[PDB]
Symmetry: C2
Subunit: 489 residues, 2 copies
């Protein structure tokens, strides 16, 4: 709020990075053009529109496949140092496999986007996989549910090789996966993401899975896939100045009460949310708490794998939005986990014991502003996990805009709530950096308003407004205007 409280670029180091981010399926559109194979999401939205809040799909998105030159202009205008976007697996390998052949148009597109960004002095941060699994592999062996722990791993590794092959010379920053926890938990736990599987009795499109097992199977394959891709990268592609890693979605955790019991609950919560995928790439295995609680439901790694996994990164991405109070749940005959996330034996509350929310509500159903949680998370990365190079690869909020409660374009552009939120977190990074945090960059999540998975188009997360009523025309929002001023000045 206060003038001296508003972040200034000179607050951060000269080499610090500021940018924006998106994901292929959310913005690309052209779902079936120039030889692009079908994805799990194409398949899910088309077959189960009832599972999308407004029954929409992303056949078009923000049409960034055809309008990338504009996205680049926008980034240049705001003075962003970098841009993080993902690559569509099927647009590159329609069948998802080597034998399926590499789609030249798919390669050409990302090739053009990369050169243009660079031409304009914007560093590309390439996310190899953002939930878009080729349907071919999905039907072939369930994709990441691959009970063999081999097929999907090799297929993902080849996909990566093609990316390193065709873009390696230009790309200096790679991210193998983005939000693996939300992907596995939502796609196989609660079943709100494609393909929509969950345990019998649960309300999802295909209640014939197992919410206590599939998320861990998928998670295991993701980790094996990551380790293999990084091995390949370090052996045949890494250069003295390039980096590879992955990004984790994470909610800050705060003890519900003062009991040491809730502090324990909090620990188990960080473990099942962040630790799940971070500990394996850090030391080669899952958090002890998860193994003691999920037991046989959580696969074991071979010695070779643990070896390939430990230290498989040069930098790590953190996608932060909110936090929750963690309240203890005792083990006893009166309680039985139903969802994989229930293995943490802790309830995640928005309201503390005083009935008040952990932070001011930002609009949609789950984002409560609590920049303190980001600070705690960075302190944990610094003191417990080796203080590696950190990039806040995602941060932002979603403005609600439904057919029942339309959000006027004027109001959509005057996103002061978003601006305030963004400046608070950027300020939080300043503090963490002075305390020793190895944070090296910040990416505002959603360069553009786009498809928001099961929420469809009911939420606008962009710093740039997209008018789909008029050829997806881009309009800077106040938040984008400030970022432009911030990056300049």
């Amino acid at each position: 709020l206060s003038p001296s409280e508003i972040p200034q670029r000179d607050w951060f180091p000269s080499d610090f990075t500021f940018g924006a981010a998106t994901s292929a399926y959310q913005i690309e559109g052209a779902w079936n053009e120039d030889g692009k194979g079908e994805s799990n999401w194409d398949h899910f939205c088309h077959n189960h529109p009832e599972r999308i809040l407004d029954g929409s799909n992303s056949d078009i998105g923000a049409n960034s496949y055809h309008m990338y030159k504009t996205d680049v202009r926008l980034l240049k205008e705001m003075g962003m140092d970098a841009y993080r976007f993902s690559i569509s697996w099927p647009r590159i390998l329609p069948k998802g496999t080597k034998e399926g052949g590499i789609n030249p148009d798919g390669i050409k597109y990302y090739r053009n986007l990369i050169n243009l960004l660079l031409e304009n002095g914007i560093e590309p941060y390439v996310t190899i996989f953002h939930w878009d699994v080729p349907q071919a592999l999905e039907e072939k062996y369930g994709g990441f549910l691959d009970k063999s722990h081999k097929s999907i791993v090799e297929d993902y590794t080849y996909f990566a090789k093609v990316c390193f092959d065709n873009f390696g010379d230009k790309v200096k920053n790679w991210l193998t996966f983005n939000d693996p926890q939300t992907f596995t938990s939502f796609s196989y736990g609660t079943g709100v993401f494609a393909p929509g599987r969950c345990s019998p009795g649960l309300d999802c499109a295909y209640p014939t899975g197992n919410s206590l097992v599939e998320p861990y199977t998928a998670g295991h394959n993701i980790l094996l896939a990551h380790a293999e891709a990084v091995d390949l990268y370090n052996k045949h592609y890494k250069r003295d100045d390039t980096r590879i890693g992955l990004a984790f979605d994470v909610m800050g955790r705060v003890p519900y009460g003062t009991s040491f019991l809730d502090k324990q609950a909090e620990e188990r919560s960080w473990d099942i949310n962040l630790g799940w995928f971070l500990e394996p790439v850090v030391r080669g295995d899952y958090p002890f708490s998860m193994r003691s609680l999920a037991r046989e439901r959580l696969p074991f790694f071979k010695d070779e794998q643990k070896e390939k996994l430990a230290g498989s990164y040069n930098m790590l991405g953190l996608n932060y939005y909110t936090s929750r109070f963690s309240k203890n749940i005792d083990i006893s005959p009166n309680y039985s986990p139903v969802l994989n996330t229930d293995d943490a034996y802790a309830s995640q509350e928005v309201n503390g014991p005083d009935g008040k929310p952990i932070g001011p509500p930002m609009g949609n159903p789950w984002i409560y502003m609590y920049p303190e949680g980001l600070k705690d998370l960075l302190m944990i990365m610094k003191n417990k996990y080796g203080n590696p190079p950190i990039y806040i690869t995602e941060n932002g909020i979603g403005d609600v805009d439904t057919k029942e409660t339309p959000l006027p374009m004027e109001a959509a552009l005057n996103d002061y709530k978003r601006l305030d939120y963004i400046q608070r977190h950027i300020a939080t990074l300043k503090e963490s950096i002075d305390l020793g945090s190895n944070v090296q960059g910040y990416f505002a999540w959603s360069l553009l308003d786009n498809f928001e998975w099961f929420a469809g188009f009911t939420e606008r997360y962009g710093i740039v407004y997209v008018d789909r009523n008029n050829n997806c025309t881009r309009y800077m929002k106040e938040s984008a205007k400030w970022l432009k001023e911030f990056n300049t000045a």
Copy 2:
């Protein structure tokens, strides 16, 4: 230790308590006189003398049953404020049950000892149970292995009732159990204690038990017994100025290395050693880590039991001797618990990473001097468990004295190593008191040299020498002389 470093009595509050302690089976003797029933230890030593290092038994002990007058004498001369001793269950209730009848001579013995201690201004801290279970009960239903979780509970409560009925008027400080963890772990885990049970395949007198289950069964019954005895006490015997509780044996735990993994191992170690019995009397249930690791092997408490257990104490005893480095052990198909203590997934090391022992060796196979471990424990009691009134009910070392390497009487009396150890721990209490610890007393373990369980008479723990070659004549050691000087001055 520097002269200004040697603790002084004025260093502590006027109401602070200094005393000595012993246990019935270890010092009494007269194992089968004046109607005393046979105990589990009488039975074990007689039937398996090969399980006692020097093949001895405690038929005589320090012969305190006939020489108690001399014991109180030593206490009064040293200026001790209190004396902790235990009551022999089989000596009070020969058959261990009410139907068996109360032994007149037994009641008499303790009545006289108590009145004498009071006549001399020495407060008696009475331990109700110290491992000596009436053999009658052991044969009738396995004693604390009682699969019904009712018989042993009721018989223990009655025994407790008798004590309250005959001594309640004179005793103001009660301790239901002493060292429940060593009792259960050694009697049913490794089998080195009576009755000597363990998992088939292990080396004990009766390898027909289960080291992964029986210690927990016994522990569970001990806790139920405690809750019931405290409930009875609070209802018909407690007076505004009387207190009841129990004492826990505990080794300090220090992370082996710097990894966060060993910090976790350390926590699981405190949990399995101290938490096992403390958490139930504090909040009504076992530590979360134990329930998650022992699972079905750790019995569940009924709601009314958790209610009786939570807050079932006015004070707590801590038996401290040494500490260990806790080193992490991952959960994996390559590791399978054998002993109940393995459930903590942590090795307890005497030597740290540098090959050096955590503290200087005190003589016997397991005691290493590390008073800072006591400080850590007191800080945990203060910051995590409510900072209750604490009494260090045992602290000391054992001088090795075997047939092969006899300890000359002169050397046994010049126990400067014990004195140093004692002065360092008393000093440590001072530091803790100033830091806010609610420590209210210190008891030197072993007023007398006596029977040391499976170690027989190969170790002298007393501050008072017992010459069994003569008529078990007592002689003050340097440690005792200093204590006398300290208590006076």
